[PDB]
Every structure is written in C-alpha cells, then in structure tokens.
Design a protein around this nucleic acid. Structure first.
Lengths: 143, 298, 35, 155, 129, 292
RNA sequence: GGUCAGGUCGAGCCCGGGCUCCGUGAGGGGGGAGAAGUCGUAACAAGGUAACCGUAGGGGAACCUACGGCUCGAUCACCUCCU
RNA sequence: AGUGGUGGCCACUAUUAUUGGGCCUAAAGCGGCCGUAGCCGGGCCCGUAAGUCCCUGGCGAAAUCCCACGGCUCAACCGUGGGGCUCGCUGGGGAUACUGCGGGCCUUGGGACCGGGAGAGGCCGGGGGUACCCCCGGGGUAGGGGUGAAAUCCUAUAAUCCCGGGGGGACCGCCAGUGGCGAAGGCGCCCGGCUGGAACGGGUCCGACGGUGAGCGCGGAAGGCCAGGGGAGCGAACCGGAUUAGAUACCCGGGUAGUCCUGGCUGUAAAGGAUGCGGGCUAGGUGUCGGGCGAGCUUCGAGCUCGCCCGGUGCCGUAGGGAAGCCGUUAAGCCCGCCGCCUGGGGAGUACGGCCGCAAGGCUGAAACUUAAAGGAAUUGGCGGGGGAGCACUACAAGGGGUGGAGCGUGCGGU
RNA sequence: GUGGGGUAACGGCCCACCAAGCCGAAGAUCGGUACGGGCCGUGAGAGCGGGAGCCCGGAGAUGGACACUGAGACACGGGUCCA
C-alpha cells in the first residue's frame, strides 16, 4: 500500500519511524554507541609505539603461497599484545628482540586485514624511530 | 513439599498503594479478584477430607475472569488466594490437581459488617481484621515489632518460638512457613535469582499495603517500617488485645520511635473503626478457636 | 524461535530440522547445569 | 457488507432523482400522517411502516413531501413519530441489536461449545458499542446510559 | 472508503488520457472540483466541462483534447509563500514555466501564474502538465 | 499439600513377606520398581540433580501398566526411609538420589533383589532418618499414631530437633487428616506418611492390622531383638531423647536367640561402610531435614 | 580573646550492609581459520527410501523413525491445465 | 614546494529514502479476526477566523556569508555602502479558498429492516451405514502369512477358508469436481431442534455513525503435557526376523505412548496465494457456482436451451508493469488511507536480561569476531539408477568358431 | 492552601498547621552521554555530521567544607579546617 502516514499532521510518527529504523544500519550503530572505541586496542590512535617480543612467520592464504614475516608486539599504551606485519623484502632482519618500534594501521577493507593475509591489522613504520621504508631502501641505519 | 508460585513475584508490589489513595488498575483487579474469591468460597461450618469436596468450593481457574471478558492468569489467582489464606480470611486445601476453598469466621463477618463500604476500604478492613486476631501474619507483624527486617529474623524467631511448647495454636502454619523459608531462602539468599515467592513474602506484601515498605532484590527481600502508621496500628492493636505476644519483645528503639512520632490519621473513619473494634472484641473466642482448628493440631 | 526461511536451502548445510534439534539439546543441557 | 464479512456485495436499492412528489399520487400530507399513526399504533417499526406505505398505499417516499411545519426540512416517518410521541427513546436500530444479543446469549448459554456463535457475539457486541459511541456524540441517548449484559435483559 | 474526490478525479483523467478515451465522467463532484476545472480549461487543457445533477453528488463530464501528460493532485496541501515557488515548481513540473500548479489562496482556487502576478501564496492543491 | 494417596491402602502390606522367604507378584513388582527409580534418580557430588516424574512416561519404562497411586506410594516410602530426596512442586514430583543411595547400591548391587531391598531398609533405619525416629518410638512402646503424635511434640520441645524438624512437621500435617480418616470413618481411604512408615518396618520386624480406619501395629520381639543389637553395634544414630520402657526391654531379654538376619560378612560389611562415611551421610540428612 | 552550656553547617574517621567496575582465576562449553588425519553417503537427477516444515523418541555423525501440512517433486500413465 | 602512508568526518548512497528506498520467487506483509489513543476521512448551506497567506512596528549583537567601490603593487586582510544570517518571537490591519471550530440540509459511504433462494456455517439429541478385530457353534483338512528372495510369526489343541450368531472401537467411500461455506485453522452418513453469516430483490428506515490500529482482547491443524476413562486398526520408543564390509534404517513379524471421550495446558507449521487490509480508475473473450431479470421449449418440476445485471470462483489474453520467472479488473498497473516488517553472509535466532508456561518450550534479543560474497531469475552444455524415438557386431537373441588348463613364438610389467 | 520567619528582593526558600496532591505512553523516573549559542566540514540541494582556535552567556582554581573585609567574593597570585 501507500507509504504511510503521509499526513500533514503526522510528522511525529514519521520521526519515530526514521529514528527506529536508523538503528538497522550498522555503521550508525558503530558510531553512536562507540562500539569500536569500547573494543579498541589502539583507542583511536592512528599510531602507536611498542616493544617487539618475537618474530613469527605466517603462511599466506591459499591459493596464494608464500611466507610473510611479522612480529608480536606488546604495546606500551595499554599493554596488550598484537601481531604486526613487516613490509619490504629482506626487511625482518632489521627488526629484532626487544625493539622500540612504531606501528600503524594497515588499511584493508573496513579497516581490516589486507589481501591474502587475514587477521593482522597493523604494520611497522619505524624501528627505534627510524623509518622502516628507509632502511628497506637502506640509505639510513638503525641505532 | 513446597509452597510457592512462579512468575508473579512482583505482582503484589502494586498492592502497596493502598496506604495512599492513589488508584491503579492493578489494584483494581486485585480488589475484584479478592471480592470474587470471597464471594464464591463458602463458610461451611471441614475438619475432614470428605467434608472438603462436599462443603468446600472447587476452583476452576478458567472460569475466573476479570470483568472485561478477558482471561486472568492463574499465578495471580494463586498469589491472591495464598494471601487470603495467610491472613485467615480464607481456608485453602490443595486436593490433588485441584484447589478447594472455604470461608472462615473472620470471613462472613468482615464482609457482613461493611457491605456498603468503599472497595478500597473494603479490602483495607479485610487486611486489618486479618491482623487483629491470632493470625500467622500477626506473628510476622509482631516479629517486625521486635525489629525483624528480613526472613532471617523470622526464621530465628520461629525457631525460638518452638522452644516453648505453648505454640499449638499456629504450629502447622508456622511449620509451613518454616519449610517455605527453607526452600526459598536459597533462592533469595544464594544466586540472587528471584523466581518464587515464599509465604513470608506474601505476608510482607499486604503489610506493605498497610504500614510497611519492602525493598526489592538484594538477593533477599529487605524491608523497613513506617512509624507514623505503626503508631495507629499498635493503638488499634492494644485497643483489642485478642492476640498473644508469642513471647516476642518490642525493641526499645521501635517504642521510642513510636513515641517520637505524632498522631497520624487513622486508617478509617473512627465510626467504622469502632464498629470493627467492637465486633472483633465480641466474637474473639469463636474466631480464635476456628484459627486454632485450621492452624493448630487440637 | 525466530525462523529465517533462508536457512532451509540445504546446500552446504544440514537439514534445518536437525540443527534446530541439536541447538535445543544444547539449551537443555546448559539450563540444567545452571539448574 | 464490507464491514466485517469484507465482501463487496451490492444489493442496495435505487430511487429516481425526483425532486418533487409524483403527480399521480393522491394522498394529502395529513392523510399520510393519519395512516402512519394508524400503522404505528399497531406495533410496527419504521422500516415496515415505509414498506406498507410504498407497497399497498403506493406512496414512493415520505421524503418527497416537505414538512408543513418546517419548509427547510423534508417530512420523514420518524419525525412524525416524534410529533405524536410514538418515536422510541432508544434508537430502534440499536434495540434490534439488543434483543438479538440477549437471545444469542441465552442460546449459547444452552450451548457452551459453539465457538463460531461466540465470535458472532464478539461481532455483534462491537456493533452495539460503536452505535452507542455514535449516539452519545449526537445526544439521542443519556450521557451515562451504558449497555450491560444484565440490564439489557430488562429491555 | 472514498476519502477525497480530487485525487480520484485527476487519477481518472490521467488514466483516460493514456488509453485515449474522449469523454470521462468523474462521479464525486464537489464545489472545489469545478473551480479546478475552470483553470486549466482557461489554459486550454480540456474542452467544456459540464455539471450533471445525478441527484446524489453530481457528476462532472469532460472531453479530452489530448494535451495532458500527467495531472496529479498534490494531496498534503503544502503551504507556500510567494518568494519560493521555484523550488516547488522544480518538484512537479518538467521545465521553465512548463505546465502549471494550482494553489488556493485567500481569494480562491486559481492558477499559480496569475497568483505570482497577483503575488499571493497559499496551499498547493494539484498540478497538471 | 495433603500428600495423600487412594486405593493402594492395602498395597504396602505386601512387604510382610520380605522378612520371610515367600515371594509374591507384588513383592517382586516392588523390587523391580525400586531399582528402576534408584537408577532413574540422579546423583553427583540441589536444583541440579532433580528429575521430574511423569507417570505416563514411567509406566512403559518397564512394561507394567501400573496405576499412579502405587508409584506415588513407593517413592513416599523411599523418602520416609531416607533413600530418596523428593521435592513436590504443586502437582509435580522431583527426585534426587542421596549419599546412602549409590553407596548401598554401590557395594551391594550383586545381592538378591529381596535381600537388596532388605539391606536398603536396614541401612536406612541404621542412621538418623525419620524411619529411625518411628523405630525409636516403637522401642519406647507406641501402639498407634497417637503416641507418635505425642513423641514428635516431645522431640521438638528439646530443641535438639532442628536436624529433623521438617520431616516431623510433614508427619504432623499428614496426621492432621489421617486422624480424621480414622476418627470417624472405618475406611482408611487415604495413606499418610505414618502408614508408609509402619509398612516397611512391617517388612522388617512389625506386624500391621487394618482396623476400622486405624493401623493397629504390634512388634515381633524375636526379630526386634535380632536388630536391636545390630543397632547397638554401630551407635551412629540418636534416640532423639526417647527411652525404651520396661516391657520391651525385658521381652528383648529372655528369648531364644533367633537367627542373625543375614550372613555375617553382610553384617560386618554394612557396619564398616556406614562407619567410614557416617559424617557425610549425616550431613546429607541435615540437608534432607535439618534447617541450620 | 580564653573556658563552659546549647544550636547550625558540617569536612572527614570507624563498623555493618546494598550496588558497580577492573584484574587473576582452577574448571566447563560452544563459535570461527587452516589443511593434513579418521569414520561414514546425508543432500543436488526419482542422490539409489522425493524433499522440506511443525512436533516427540532414538542413534558416533551425516541421520532414522512416528503424526499434520507443502510443491521450493520427478517419469508417466494421469482426476487432468492446454489439447 | 610539495608528494606519499594511517586514522577520523561528508559525498559516493534512492545502502535511511519527507523530497526519495524494498517486503510473490533474493533481506522483509505478519497464521487469523476485533478494537482504544493516534492518523486519514462524503457532499451542500450559515458563522468564526486558530491554522494558511499579504501589508506594516519592534527585535533576533558583533565577527563571519554574498556583492560593488576604495587602501596596502593586485590578491589574501581591512574600510564605506548594499543584501542575507538560527532566526523559532511579538503589536495592528486585510483576506476566507482550504484544514480547524461551531449551527442547519442531503443520501451515494456505512448500518438496520423485510421476502423467495442457496450452502461439508457451528452446537445439541436420535437414527443408520458398509468394512475391520475378537468370541461362540458347524464344515474342512495341511497350510497360512509375508518377500526381490526368504526368514520371524500363526497353525494338527484344527490354522487359512465358508456358513449361523453375539461383542468391540474408529470412520462416514461412489455420487466429488478449479463444487460450497467459513475471518483463519478448518468443515462431508440421515433426520429433529438452537444458532451465526452472506448474496440476491426493495430506499424500507437512520444519516458519515467510516478505513486503519500502536498498547489490549479472542478463538486458532498436528504433535507434546496434566487428571480420569478408552484402546478395533494403526503405530513414536522398544523386541525379534531379514539385508549389508559395516546397518542403531529402508523390508517383514510384533509392540508401549499416541490416535478416541471428558475437563485443562501448551499458542505452534512451507498456518503458502510465500501476495497486511479499504476506496477510484484502467482492452477483452471464455466456463463454472449462487441470486435476480427477459425470452423460448416444457411429458408442467424448485424441469430444459440463449442473452444480460449482481456476487463468488478459474483459464486465455491487449496495453501496462517487472531482473526475469511471470502478473495483467481476483494486478505484482496509476492514484488515495493505516500498521508491521527489511537494511551484505555468518556468528544467531545464539549470549545476557525480562515476561509467560506445570514441562517441553513460547514472546523479546544483542556483542566481539570472521568473510569476497551470499542470494534471485534465466541461456548453453554435461549428466539422470527421468521420460520418448531411432540404432548395432566396440551390443545382444539364434547358431557356429575360440582363448585362460601343457608346451613353445612374440611382446608388456617386475628381477 | 492558611499564617508567619528569613532574604536586597517575590518564592516551601524555611517554619507550624491543613489537604492529597505534582510528573508519566506527546517517554516521568533511572542510566549513558555533553558546557549552550553566533558558527565550522562536506554536499547540486533537501540533508548529514562537529562545537578546539574568535565573540556572547555558563562554570571552575588539588577534592571538599567554611568565615572576615567589602558596593560587589566565599576571593587563581586574601584567610581557616579535613583529606
């Protein structure tokens, strides 16, 4: 039937209808009730600083085949431990045990994992404040 | 054997409004249900098993309905009938897969003397008349006077009261309360999940309708008094002392708080109040022996 | 027991009757453990 | 009859758009008054009164002759019933529902398992209650007047 | 249950147009409908429109000159001032001054163009183009 | 509420043959029902171990076609002897196994069914159970329900009764209508817990006689002696302040020593098992009936 | 200004109790990602007993059985839709 | 003189839809009816002028927004002037079309009434039906029963089978169909009674009394549950026979609950037309069902043939609609009224909480986390222990010859 | 509501007496959350979001509590106490 109530006085019922159904969207819920914040490990910080605790390699997702290095990092801000992918070929050699490192979002879909490798959400940008990409290019040197 | 009802734990919470004049539909249906139950249940003399089902009233719940052509849930009826029994205004017997009811001496008199009196007041006089004679609810009320604030006080009080052997007027009723306490204290003292209502709880309700105020879940069913109403209540009580103390002493704190209070308006007009006072004083012996029959072994 | 009809197209799954029975059994056990 | 049966039937009845009474008709406006009071003194409601007027007396409608006592109004049988005090004080159209309701209450009290008739009761009761809701708004009833399942027996 | 005569009337008109029938008969005639019918006939959208006394509610008869694309009854009676017809014009008509809107103002029901020349806003009631 | 039965008033006298060696259909039916209920009952060391009893369901579990009243009576007996924890929600029954149960069953599963039932009843009487209270009432010399009605009041008087209050209160509740059944009516139409206690003991050392609504019971002193010394062998059970009067004591004296009720290894094993776990079963009995 | 009698605000302090959050936790369950391991053939063609729904019992699982319903069923003969 | 990475916000997004979203087949119209607030509401006449609109008084600060000119070299910035700003306010005047409010008139909406006709409308009492099982007696020997085969089982204490007689429970075949009735679930032997509802024909009465319905109420297939009865057959569980590598099954022989009656609960399903309900309009043809109307036939019937109107119910089908499947006056087309429902898949109909229920369980209902899709229609192929047709020596029926048994020739696998 | 205290000042603001009222489905109470406004970011616009830099109003000085002097304070660079 006709979309209702198309009345000149029924603005109230229209407003309750729309407010009610706006909760059906997921992103509005994630914004309003702040669910990402109450589940946040990084508390909305675009960056963080942490200490590497172990080097771990991961098998890619099939049908892709390959071994990707990463490090399990304990975060100074709150103490939680999370995996951190290391980019750049021949790069994990420059990340070691008990290293001051700088970690950053990895920018997959929905802010999730990137491509084949799932779960991992973050990447290494500096080790001891020294840019990982530079040392991958090799012009600078870790202290 | 356990006595208790599911679901409607907070249904009698709406009864507390009768202290004031505020009107609510829940209280309206409570009154109507009380009226109907007392109406159908007769005053036979059963003192037998055969007398029950002959001079009692079989309860068909599906027949019991509000005046809206709308069915009313059974557990509400169970609670309202358990209350009436608890106050001695009615007598209940659960013959297997059935419920039978007969009026008491307090019934057929409390109704008879106040026929043309307002419904809220009708129910109110029913509770007060229940209190004023030797009722297990009266035992709870005196326990409160001693300063009992929870089920634990009632448990210890009845345990002590059984240390006298002059306890044969309410022995079986108090034993029923004791076992109800035994089987519902775990609910209302462990796990903090309230799904059943003991006899102490339905007793606490009604008192909350008269002079008490009962808090909600702390696990338990903690309670508090109201000294202004307590003054008038105890005045009416000492006006007609046709109910024992049961060896329960009043704490001095409560007595001074009674003294420290001013005069609060009586529950009713002093005319009908005096009518109730003198009719209770007149027929105390008959009601006393009736309650002895249906609460005591001999 | 809200019933999504879409869960009845049997590809990649069991007949919905049996998963319903399984989950009901699970519910019975879990309630009994709590009592 | 789409009110509850929800069927779109049409057995309604037609009249021609005649603004004046017919010429061939012969009775005078007082003659019809005499005849209708005569009929009403027998215990006839308004409907069959009109039927008798149209069928044997051949009067197509009282509406066609204007009220002599009010030019702005068209003469009706019921207004004449008011004129002589033979109009009823409950609306008739509700009194039939009253009598039907009580009779059905008796029948179903003899027969407590005819749930279809029970729904029939549930249906008719809304009819009396809606028409009462109308008539209260119009003032043709006492403003406290209220159907009762017991009092209605007396009527 | 019938609610308004006007939406049904213009719906009838639009239905009859696409099929291309010559004559129409709008059954629930009202005083408002005639004041409507005058307007677009003055702009030429229809031929003669005649009232017919059926004895119950009157019926309006119109023959169609085949110059209606769609004629809708804006039902929720939006009120409008004079400085802002352009917005509403963009909502129900396809181009600059193409077609008309019908409004009711303190004087009476009459076309929107002469309204803006007279500078009197009011309640939109219909539109046809 | 009333906790009553109909029709089966004479059903429970069939255990009289338990002390003998004759086995009738009713006795073996009882022996078949008891173990069925025991296995059905749950046990795991409160609201987490209670199975509902549905009569239409527990009628085909063994192809029996048994009326409900018999079924009610048998578990009433099992509770009365402290072998089964019963909770009666209004018109509903809930069953849990005790500590003694799944101990007597655990060790003596391989005995004959008749002797299994016998040892179950004996073990029940051995410890502080309602049945032991009725047994001590008999030993003090009660004849009928009235003496028990006096003895319960006497016991609750001393205020050591807190362990067994509710059981006695239930008995008193039942008696409050059994007395009516016998006071005026010659027909013992219903069965109270007192009658269920009298039976069962009749299966050990008593003898019952229905008499115009009453349940006139007498002891047989030979077996009463044969179990008295057993009771004194393990004194892990209170007399509840009662005392054997003279005539019972002397009749115990000066008798030809009747045969020991079972094999000697059976006696000593029953002694040891309850001795090495007396505390736990006593606490369970406190949970059964004790308040504090 | 000191001392005492009293009143008011009262910051705080001790005890009893009600409520909430965090940490750690023996122990129990189920959910998802991996492919290696094992058992079985459940479904899709009439999936080798049509399939599915509601209800209840059983089974290591897929699952099986029972009553009421559905065409999200086939081959056809076909009551038969067309013919 | 910037460019790159991450995070957050608006657009994209008609993936929040008032403008402006979808709910037959993919997410979603509820299992049905009633009805309160609320919302939407027939026509005409008289009045008010709250809303609505126009004019005018005050006010809604500055900075900021837009524009011209001018100053710093133009610009950014600033000045003068002009216009807007959340502006929701308020004084006075004017209009009356409409919404509102008040008084009067009117039936078409609606409702009531009346008369032939229709119908598995419901409830109650009586009567009957064939069939099945048991029991008794007679005849009669030697098997019956069942399956792909058998086997279990019944049987010579007389089975199976035929005849005479008695008992028991369930159900009302053919007529039967897209029939009919009911709000839906659903409803079928015959008669008597009570009762609901509709059509059709008549303005015969009243006068908008209406639609929808949050919250509420009502009954509502099976199965399960509580109390007592009942139990012919059937048959959950279970007990055997058989099949199989394994068979907790399919097959067979048994068999309790249930299936039935009374009094209650449980509130359920692919309760499906997978289509929430009311009004107006939009090519048609064709049948059946009921009522009316007009003719004709009539062995004179509530009989028989053709057309129309009304109401119900099917098929085909124009335009139109739609992703298509398809629908197409019984819309899923265009408008007007009112609620619910939907916002990627799963986690899930779960956790937690609340309410209900005796219990099974019902109503309500997230989160983290995971995933590149799930899902719908339809085309081509392949395949079917689907169907139809045509074929044969890489197929078989008829007939013949002949290999693998011994040795050897030749070659394949292995040493 | 009656009749008064106190205030610069009206006022349950406070006191004494009287009466039973006030708010709630047009969302009371409780909880979460937040200085409000002029404005700011994006968008064709309906609209969506944000309130830090400037101006107006609000409030605060480690948490709490309290007093003098003053026209103005319970007073960031006056005073006293607790923690």
């Amino acid at each position: 039937g006709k979309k209702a109530p198309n009345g000149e006085f029924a603005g109230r019922k229209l407003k309750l209808k729309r407010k009610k159904f706006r909760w059906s969207d997921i992103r509005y819920k994630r914004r309003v009730l702040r669910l990402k914040e109450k589940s946040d490990p990084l508390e909305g910080a675009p960056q963080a600083r942490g200490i590497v605790l172990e080097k771990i390699a991961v098998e890619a997702k099939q049908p892709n085949s390959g071994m990707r290095k990463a490090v399990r990092v304990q975060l100074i801000k709150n103490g939680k431990v999370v995996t951190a992918f290391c980019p750049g070929d021949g790069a994990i050699k420059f990340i070691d045990e008990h290293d001051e490192v700088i970690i950053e979002g990895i920018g997959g879909p929905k802010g999730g994992s990137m491509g084949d490798i799932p779960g991992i959400r973050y990447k290494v940008v500096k080790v001891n404040r020294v840019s990982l990409k530079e040392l991958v290019k090799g012009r600078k040197e870790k202290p | 054997k356990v006595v208790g009802i599911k679901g409607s734990v907070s249904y009698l919470q709406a009864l507390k409004y009768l202290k004031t004049k505020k009107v609510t539909k829940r209280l309206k249906e409570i009154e109507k249900l009380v009226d109907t139950l007392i109406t159908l249940a007769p005053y036979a003399p059963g003192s037998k098993i055969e007398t029950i089902r002959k001079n009692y009233a079989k309860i068909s719940f599906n027949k019991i309905k509000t005046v809206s052509r709308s069915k009313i849930g059974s557990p509400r009826i169970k609670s309202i009938m358990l209350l009436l029994w608890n106050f001695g205004l009615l007598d209940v017997k659960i013959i297997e897969n059935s419920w039978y009811v007969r009026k008491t001496k307090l019934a057929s008199l409390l109704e008879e003397n106040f026929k043309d009196l307002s419904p809220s007041e009708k129910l109110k006089v029913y509770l007060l008349g229940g209190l004023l004679v030797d009722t297990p609810a009266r035992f709870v009320y005196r326990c409160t006077l001693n300063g009992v604030e929870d089920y634990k006080g009632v448990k210890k009080a009845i345990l002590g009261y059984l240390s006298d052997q002059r306890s044969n007027s309410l022995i079986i009723g108090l034993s029923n309360m004791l076992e109800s306490i035994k089987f519902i204290e775990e609910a209302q003292a462990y796990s903090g999940k309230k799904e059943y209502i003991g006899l102490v709880d339905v007793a606490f309700y009604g008192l909350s309708g008269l002079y008490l105020d009962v808090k909600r879940e702390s696990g338990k069913l903690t309670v508090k008094p109201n000294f202004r109403e307590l003054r008038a209540l105890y005045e009416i009580d000492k006006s007609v002392a046709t109910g024992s103390d049961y060896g329960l002493s009043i704490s001095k704190e409560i007595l001074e708080n009674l003294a420290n209070t001013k005069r609060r308006k009586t529950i009713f007009s002093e005319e009908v109040q005096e009518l109730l006072v003198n009719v209770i004083k007149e027929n105390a012996i008959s009601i006393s022996q009736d309650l002895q029959n249906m609460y005591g072994i001999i | 027991m809200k019933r999504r009809p879409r869960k009845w197209k049997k590809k990649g799954r069991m007949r919905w009757k049996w998963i319903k029975k399984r989950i009901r059994r699970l519910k019975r056990q879990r309630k009994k453990e709590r009592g | 009859a789409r009110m509850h049966a929800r069927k779109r039937g049409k057995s309604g009845s037609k009249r021609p758009p005649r603004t004046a009474p017919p010429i061939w008709v012969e009775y005078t406006v007082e003659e019809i008054e005499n005849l209708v009071v005569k009929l009403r003194k027998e215990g006839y409601s308004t409907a069959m009164i009109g039927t008798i007027l149209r069928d044997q007396y051949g009067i197509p409608s009282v509406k066609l002759f204007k009220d002599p006592d009010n030019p702005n109004r068209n003469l009706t049988i019921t207004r004449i019933l008011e004129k002589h005090g033979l109009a009823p004080e409950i609306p008739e159209d509700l009194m039939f529902l009253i009598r039907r309701a009580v009779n059905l209450r008796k029948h179903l009290e003899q027969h407590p398992k005819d749930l279809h008739s029970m729904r029939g009761l549930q249906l008719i009761e809304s009819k009396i209650r809606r028409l009462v809701k109308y008539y209260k708004r119009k003032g043709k009833l006492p403003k406290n007047w209220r159907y009762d399942p017991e009092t209605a027996k007396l009527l | 249950t019938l609610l308004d005569p006007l939406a049904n009337a213009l719906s009838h008109i639009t239905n009859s147009e696409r099929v291309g029938k010559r004559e129409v008969y709008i059954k629930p005639a009202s005083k408002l409908i005639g004041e409507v019918l005058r307007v677009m006939q003055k702009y030429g959208y229809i031929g003669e429109f005649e009232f017919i006394d059926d004895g119950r509610a009157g019926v309006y008869r119109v023959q169609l000159l085949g110059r209606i694309n769609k004629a809708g009854a804006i039902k929720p009676r939006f009120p409008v001032k004079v400085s802002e017809f352009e917005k509403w014009e963009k909502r129900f008509l396809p181009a600059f001054e193409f077609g008309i809107l019908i409004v009711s103002t303190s004087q009476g029901v009459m076309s929107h163009k002469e309204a803006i020349e007279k500078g009197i806003g009011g309640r939109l009631i219909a539109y046809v183009y």
